[PDB]
Amino acid sequence: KIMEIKLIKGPKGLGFSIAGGVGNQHIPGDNSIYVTKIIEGGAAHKDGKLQIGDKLLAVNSVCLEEVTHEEAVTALKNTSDFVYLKVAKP
């Protein structure tokens, strides 16, 4: 089940960590980017939609499927205050 998440980055940034990526599989066979910690009262947390275990599919139509950890991190660090996430739930 794919969902849309729209965020406003805060003073602690977006408020979550990721893993995975081509060459850094978080789950064997799966090169995807996964959300691994949602941080207390950060942006992601206040909004409430994003969940530990969520696959990230996109950020601002920069595509996060089959990319490297650092390609994903780059794209997520290269964001304004306005952040759109497309995710797939388990």
């Binding site: 960590s17 691994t36 910690k37 950890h69 991190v73």
Partner: peptide, 4 residues
């Protein structure tokens, strides 16, 4: 993992 990478904090964002």
């Amino acid at each position: 993992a990478t904090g964002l």
